Design a binder for these strands. Structure first.
Ligand SMILES: [Zn+2]
Ligand SMILES: [Zn+2]
Ligand SMILES: [Zn+2]
Lengths: 397, 814, 131, 105, 71
RNA sequence: GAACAGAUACUGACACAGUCCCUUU
RNA sequence: GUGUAGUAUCUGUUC
């Protein structure tokens, strides 16, 4: 009456995808996280047939996966936040062909809990600190200082626990060698339960606050408080310092907002709509994912909507100020939950359901014939979709 | 009136009589504190407390009852805060650790009960007092109250006081308060460094020397509090300190040097190197200072400077060694204790930094001094260096010189200290196999000192043998080991207890290192001499002999007859009375080994006949011995011999067998799944409401068994026990309540939270109160752990017309 | 009333929407194949002899504490997520034997008094028989 | 630990320091006070390890000569996933014993 | 006196806990569990012809005031 | 079953000689 | 042999 468990096929559903030089060389590789299986795969420009390299089962539920590199190194380190109460930092050895544990710190009970961190992972772009936040009331900050032995070390976690608060999305903000800054969609609900008149959900908006990380005094305290007028869902990182101005984007319903700390006023831009949609006119439109091709010449942001339309956001900004946000129509792809653009024109799209395709950029779409859109044009936007012209299908999974 | 008379009779009952009446009075005052009041109580307590005829016991009882009644009066101790503190402060001002710390939490609790305004109105008048003693104790009290209820509510007052110009007394009081806060909080004031930096910055330029000296010492205190980081906040303090360095001379100069030495290790390497280079001149000029306190300060500064990885090793080696070795090796300062404690620590740090070879070569030449204090000091320095760094940088000549110096120092010894023993052991262990040629000489000296002079250092020689047994084993010799063993054999008849314990420990080390079969004196002859030793009444000899007996039983259970086995068993039956926990643990272990060696019939019966002693201390030890016997033997060969014992009507035997079953289940682990059927009738009998002890023991048994069988799917047998475990929750005894809670927690991981959730759901909303409280406590206990695996087991509750209590997302159908 | 009883419990971590007990390869044995919404397909194989069962149980018990998961998740607690595992042996942990370090493989083979080739053959016999 | 209801743990976020145990607390579990199957290591918060508190026993505060571990029962019960087990209370029994020794010598 | 474990946690009940707060805490925990799991959200995505982002948005702005207004 | 006062037992692998972990104008 | 908490069982007087 005793059974034995066996497996025939492996899970193919893709939830996360992070690009980087995990082997330390100049060939980009893709790390894909399944429901409970961690897989590593790389493409080949000569042939285009993607071959799996590593596949190890984690025996757990993975909720986040990010990669980072030290300020000076050439290796990308994988940080995985799972349902457990600990954070693990991974490394890849091409010779051993196996993931090696490096550091391990525990900060609470295991399992998917409301106040246990592990959902949102925030990593500074330069790679000097990592922030892990929970759904409610719990936030943690780590400082990944390196020692003289050409290795990395982890310090004690910091305290940033705000009482009775909800978190929507956390992403790092480039500062340019000063104290790192983190931005999150802060929200309060204490007054919601204190109103027995049924007037809690209405006129209760969310805020956006910046968290500072002072390396001198080693503490985290709230600095800013910028209430919004819409209900955003997730943020977009923007390169700062030398290449472009530091800031974040605010994806919302039929609107995108650029925000910055200092003397930068808020700027809004309507979302373009397809010609004669076959949907409910009152239905809203949101964004699902984005991309960042941080080329040394210039940087452009990709986007995707519910219908599966790729845009191209270009930041037309001055040295200190910003003039307007220019949008563009790029192509149309099946709905995806996570996508990443690669070098040499390679584009990887991980569809939510069905098959996964790998497109190659043949035409850069530099000032296409179709008119563009910008925030400088007063008053909705319409555009006529066209078949796939900029991208050509070469391989499918 | 009556209340005052009540207080008087209560305090006479507390101070005089047996402890039980004191405990009864404490219980009465705790249960009735809600109506005693504060006015008359304190007006009767304080005059007696302040009297100088107060002893330690009466003071402790008074402060304990005061602490017990602090929480009983939340906001009824405010009018007499000044009268409380004027008496409390002299208690803490004494240089006693316990008294000062206890007064510390007393004042902390008093301030927590009070508020900022109350303490302000209480403690303004004494700010500008003139006496230094009351000023110091008031500053300490201010530090405690500022620690209480947070510093930020107190920082603006410190700023206001220190930003005045009336008199220097207020400024000194404020700076002293900041000093005490910094020295007591530690690293808890890191995010509030500026609140004190801007307070203390202005005081470094005043013409008065006292204020700037205290400001410099405060800066040093803040620097040592924020040792890792804080350079950015302290960057604007360097200039006044440097001007004081090149301006002042004396006590203020010492304070400024201490501050700069504490501040150096808080920054990078280049700046630290430059500042050390700048301060080299002052260090050289003050190396020849006459004052011993100045010597301590300069030694601390040198150690702090050398403790940073920013100065080149070669420059330090070529600069600081000659003058430091010329000046800091004397005897006049070595007479005072703290001076050469600090000197030893500084020399150890310097040796760790620059290296061991040069410093050891320079220092070993001083082993020829006649002074015994100098000899022990240099030996302590050498042993500390050897323990810290190692023995990987010593050549042949230094080895020979060190061995000769150690031998000469050992030739003449008079002080009764084990530091020589520790140093010799550490040095020999560090040497390893390089000490082979000098083994015969040192052993001859050891025996020569062993066999003369009333056998006073025989304990020291035995300690030497125990320490050097491992190195002598690694040196590949057996003849000298045999000589040492036989010598200890005839020298085993010493009457002295400490000497007997030491030689027994030496023999234990010998038998540990050398083979039991190859040991030159036969074991069959050692045991007859060893058995009468067990009857001595000294802790050291008993522990040593029991450990040796356990080792020889574990490793030498082949040449021993049953007669002396029974003899030593009977001896241990009464030896189990030993008060030390280690001796009892060793006795239980050796019972385990002897029961493994011999058939578990006679020893098991002997253990079972020792359950009638009417003493609680040894019954649990016998229970643990029985459990370890059953664990080391076959588990199913002891159960028939223990099940039949329960029918004895005496409660002590039943409690003992239940505890033995609990311990056996705990020790077995995952192999106890087969032995659950036999214990079910005993648990069925035990869970009946006969006595609290039986129920508690049964709950412990259930918890241990459930934890052991976790992960094997034995829910079928464990489910039946819950029906009888559950009704044991309605009791007022803390012990049984804790046992039941632990049993439920242990069963939760093994049966699943669904059963306990179903049990708790019925009584969760009972109209009564106590049942609701206990059900809510159980629900909280099950909710804290494994909260994720609860959404599926949650029931469905129908909603009203107003609110919605139905989760339609789980009703989706595909 | 006549309440039923549970004889097996397991947690795959993925939603299962199909169950069927048939034979995959011709001339095989009745196996319990299942599919999940994630996309993975697995089978359940009953044991034949008690010696194989105890050998596999010992191997799994040793590997649970000798080969911890990469993300530091308690494998026993993860499998016993909602209900304790009953009469089920995880095959993934046993199959992870091949990719282990040679030193640990030698140590576990010495502990089990078996050779690594024998362990690999014993592990692959089930896969060859039921696939 | 459990035998004294007047002792309260620090119960704060753990850091990177390692707890230490003295000679008489060698093989005792920190929480449940057991002697079987040490499995994991004990972590203590930063403020409990500073200055004079470096290298001290978690229970009695003696010199540190042995490490602090957790038994298998605590790991299974997941009671190790909590704050540092350092005892901040001074202990009434120790003070009473010290005062009694002082009075009778 | 040993009750500090149950005082430093969110959602812990007490003696005078009524039905509304318990039910709203249960709903919040259920929504958090829905968000955490991947296949439990894929089931919802397949059941109704929307995307993952829309379901996540609905869950995010459904956690504020569930089970109706308070009383 | 609320109390002002006495006596006898049981439970917590509870503890028992610590000399020092010390500290400014 | 001593001390540190808790619990249980038998008594003087009074509701
Ligand atoms: Zn702590
Ligand atoms: Zn200890
Ligand atoms: Zn334990």
């Amino acid at each position: 009456m005793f059974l034995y468990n066996l497996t025939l096929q492996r899970a193919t559903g893709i939830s996360f995808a992070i690009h980087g030089n995990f082997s330390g060389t100049k060939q980009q590789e893709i790390v894909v996280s399944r429901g409970k299986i961690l897989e590593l795969l790389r493409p080949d420009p000569n042939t285009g047939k993607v071959h799996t390299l590593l596949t190890v089962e984690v025996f757990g539920v993975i909720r986040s996966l990010m990669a980072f590199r030290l300020t000076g190194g050439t290796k990308d380190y994988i940080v995985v936040g799972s349902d457990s109460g600990r954070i693990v930092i991974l490394e890849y050895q091409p010779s051993k062909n196996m993931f090696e544990k490096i550091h391990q710190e525990t900060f609470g009970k295991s399992g998917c809990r409301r106040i246990v961190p592990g959902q949102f992972l925030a990593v500074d772009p330069k790679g000097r600190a990592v922030m892990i936040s929970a759904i409610e009331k719990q936030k943690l900050v780590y400082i990944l200082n390196r020692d003289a032995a050409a290795r990395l070390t982890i310090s004690s976690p910091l305290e940033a626990h705000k009482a009775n608060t909800l978190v929507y999305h956390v992403v790092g903000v480039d500062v340019g060698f000063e104290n790192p800054m983190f931005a999150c969609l802060e929200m309060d609900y204490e007054e919601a339960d204190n109103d027995p008149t049924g007037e809690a959900a209405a006129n209760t908006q969310q805020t956006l606050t910046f968290y500072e990380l002072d390396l001198g005094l080693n503490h985290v305290v709230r600095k800013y408080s910028e209430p919004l007028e819409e209900h955003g869902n997730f943020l977009i990182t923007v390169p700062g310092g030398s290449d472009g101005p530091s800031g974040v984007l605010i994806c919302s319903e039929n609107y995108i907002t650029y925000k910055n700390f200092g003397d930068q006023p808020d700027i809004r831009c309507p979302i373009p709509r397809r010609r004669n949609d076959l949907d409910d006119p009152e239905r809203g439109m949101i964004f699902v994912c984005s991309a960042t091709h941080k080329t040394k010449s210039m940087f452009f942001f990709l986007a995707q909507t519910e219908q599966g339309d790729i845009f191209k956001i270009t930041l037309e900004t001055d040295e200190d100020m910003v003039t307007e946000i220019r949008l563009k129509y790029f192509d149309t792809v099946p709905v995806a939950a996570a996508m990443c653009v690669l070098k040499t024109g390679f584009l990887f799209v991980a569809s939510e359901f069905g098959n996964h395709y790998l497109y190659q950029i043949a035409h850069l779409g530099d000032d296409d014939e179709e008119p563009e859109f910008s925030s400088a044009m007063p008053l909705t936007f319409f555009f006529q979709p066209r078949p796939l012209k900029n991208l050509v299908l070469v391989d499918e999974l | 009136e009556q209340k005052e008379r009540k207080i008087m009779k209560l305090l006479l009952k507390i101070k005089n009589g047996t402890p039980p009446m004191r405990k009864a009075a404490l219980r009465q005052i705790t249960d009735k504190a809600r109506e005693f009041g504060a006015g008359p109580l304190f007006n009767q307590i304080l005059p007696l407390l302040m009297s100088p005829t107060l002893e330690d016991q009466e003071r402790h009882l008074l402060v304990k009852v005061i602490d017990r009644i602090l929480y009983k009066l939340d906001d009824l101790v405010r009018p007499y805060v000044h009268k409380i503190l004027v008496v409390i402060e002299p208690l803490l001002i004494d240089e006693d650790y316990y008294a000062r710390v206890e007064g510390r939490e007393i004042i902390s609790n008093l301030a927590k009960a009070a508020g900022l305004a109350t303490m302000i109105s209480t403690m303004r008048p004494d700010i500008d007092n003139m006496d230094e003693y009351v000023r110091n104790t008031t500053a300490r009290a201010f530090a405690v109250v500022a620690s209480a209820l947070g510093i930020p509510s107190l920082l603006p007052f410190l700023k206001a006081v220190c930003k005045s110009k009336k008199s220097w007394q207020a400024r000194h009081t404020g700076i002293k308060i900041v000093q005490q806060i910094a020295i007591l909080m530690g690293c808890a004031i890191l995010p509030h460094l500026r609140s004190l930096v801007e307070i203390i910055e202005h005081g470094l330029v005043d013409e008065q020397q006292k204020v700037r000296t205290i400001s410099a010492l405060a800066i040093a205190a803040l620097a040592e509090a924020a040792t890792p980081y804080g350079i950015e906040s302290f960057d604007s303090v360097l200039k006044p300190l440097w001007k004081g360095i090149r301006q002042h001379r004396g006590k203020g100069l010492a304070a400024f040097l201490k501050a700069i030495g504490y501040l150096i290790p808080l920054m990078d390497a280049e700046y630290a190197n430059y500042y050390t280079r700048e301060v080299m001149l002052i260090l050289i000029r003050e190396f020849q200072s006459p004052d011993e306190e100045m010597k301590k300060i300069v030694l601390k500064v040198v150690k702090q400077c050398c403790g940073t990885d920013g100065v080149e090793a070669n420059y330090i080696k070529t600069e600081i060694l000659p003058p430091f070795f010329k000046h800091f090796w004397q005897h006049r300062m070595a007479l005072d204790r703290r001076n050469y404690r600090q000197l030893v620590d500084t020399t150890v740090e310097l040796a760790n930094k620059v290296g061991a070879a040069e410093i050891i070569s320079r220092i070993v030449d001083d082993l020829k001094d006649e002074a015994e204090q100098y000899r022990k000091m240099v030996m302590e320095t050498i042993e500390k260096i050897m323990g810290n760094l190692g023995a990987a940088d010593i050549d042949h000549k230094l080895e020979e010189q060190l061995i000769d110096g150690i031998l000469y120092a050992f030739q003449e010894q008079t002080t009764e200290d084990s530091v020589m023993l520790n140093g010799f052991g550490t040095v020999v262990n560090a040497l390893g196999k390089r000490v082979k040629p000098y083994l015969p000489q040192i052993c001859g000296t050891v025996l020569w000192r062993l066999n003369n002079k009333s056998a006073k250092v025989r304990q020291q020689a035995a300690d030497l043998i125990s320490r050097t047994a491992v190195v002598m084993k690694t040196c590949q010799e057996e003849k000298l080991m045999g000589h040492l063993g036989v010598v200890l054999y005839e020298y085993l008849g010493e009457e002295y207890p400490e000497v007997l314990g030491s030689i027994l420990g030496a023999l234990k080390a010998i038998v540990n290192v050398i083979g039991m079969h190859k040991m030159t004196p036969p074991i069959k002859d050692l045991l007859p001499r060893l058995t009468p030793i067990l009857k001595n009444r000294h802790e050291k000899v008993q522990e040593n002999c029991i450990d040796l007996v356990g080792r020889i039983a574990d490793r030498g259970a082949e040449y021993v007859s049953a007669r002396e086995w029974m003899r030593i068993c009977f001896e241990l039956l009464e030896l189990l009375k030993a008060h030390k926990k280690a001796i009892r643990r060793a006795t239980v272990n050796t019972f385990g080994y002897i029961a493994k060696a011999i058939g578990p019939h006679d020893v098991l019966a002997t253990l079972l006949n020792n359950l009638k002693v009417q003493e609680r201390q040894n019954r649990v030890c016998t229970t643990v011995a029985i459990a370890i016997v059953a664990e080391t033997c076959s588990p199913f060969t002891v159960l028939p011999a223990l099940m039949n014992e329960y029918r004895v009507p005496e409660l002590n035997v039943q409690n003992g067998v239940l505890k033995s079953l609990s311990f056996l289940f705990e020790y077995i682990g995952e192999m106890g799944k087969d032995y659950i059927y036999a214990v079910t009738p005993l648990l069925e009998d035990a869970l009946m409401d006969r006595d609290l002890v039986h129920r508690q023991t049964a709950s412990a048994v259930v918890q241990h068994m459930s934890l052991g069988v976790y992960g094997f799917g034995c829910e079928d047998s464990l489910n039946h026990l819950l029906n009888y475990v559950w009704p044991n929750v309605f009791e007022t005894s803390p012990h049984v309540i804790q046992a039941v809670m632990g049993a439920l927690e242990g069963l939760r991981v093994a049966i699943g939270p669904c059963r306990m959730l179903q049990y708790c759901l019925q009584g969760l909303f009972h109209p009564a109160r106590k049942v609701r409280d206990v059900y809510w406590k159980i629900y909280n206990s099950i909710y804290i752990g494994s909260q994720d695996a609860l959404i599926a087991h949650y029931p469905r509750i129908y909603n009203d017309d107003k609110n919605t209590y139905i989760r339609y997302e789980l009703d989706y159908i595909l | 009333s006549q309440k039923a009883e549970v004889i097996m419990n397991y947690h795959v971590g993925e939603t299962v929407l199909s169950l069927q007990k048939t034979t995959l390869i011709p001339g095989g044995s009745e196996s319990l194949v299942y599919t999940t919404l994630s996309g993975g397909i697995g089978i359940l194989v009953p044991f034949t002899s008690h010696e194989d069962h105890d050998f596999f149980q010992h191997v799994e018990m040793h590997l649970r504490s000798e080969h911890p998961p990469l993300c530091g998740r308690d494998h026993l607690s993860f499998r016993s997520y909602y209900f304790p595992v009953k009469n089920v042996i995880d095959g993934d942990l046993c199959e992870q034997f091949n990719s282990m370090e040679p030193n640990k493989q030698k140590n576990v083979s010495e502990e089990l008094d078996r050779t690594p080739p024998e362990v690999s053959k014993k592990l692959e016999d089930i896969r060859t028989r039921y696939a | 630990a459990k035998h004294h209801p007047d002792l309260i743990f620090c119960r704060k976020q753990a850091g990177v320091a390692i707890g230490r145990l003295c000679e008489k607390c060698d093989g005792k579990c920190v929480i449940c006070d057991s002697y079987v199957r040490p499995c994991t290591l004990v972590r203590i918060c930063d403020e409990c390890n500073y200055g004079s508190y470096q290298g001290r026993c978690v229970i009695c505060g003696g010199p540190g000569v042995s490490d602090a571990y957790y038994c298998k029962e605590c790991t299974i019960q997941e009671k190790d996933r909590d704050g540092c087990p350092k005892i901040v209370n001074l202990g009434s029994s120790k003070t009473d014993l010290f005062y009694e020794r002082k009075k009778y010598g | 006196q040993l009750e500090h474990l149950q005082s430093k946690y969110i959602g812990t009940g007490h003696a005078d806990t009524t039905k509304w707060e318990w039910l709203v805490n249960q709903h919040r925990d259920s929504y958090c569990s829905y968000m955490g799991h991947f296949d439990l959200l894929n089931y919802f995505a397949i059941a109704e012809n929307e995307s993952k982002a829309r379901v996540r948005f609905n869950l995010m702005e459904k956690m504020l005031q569930p089970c109706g207004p308070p009383a």
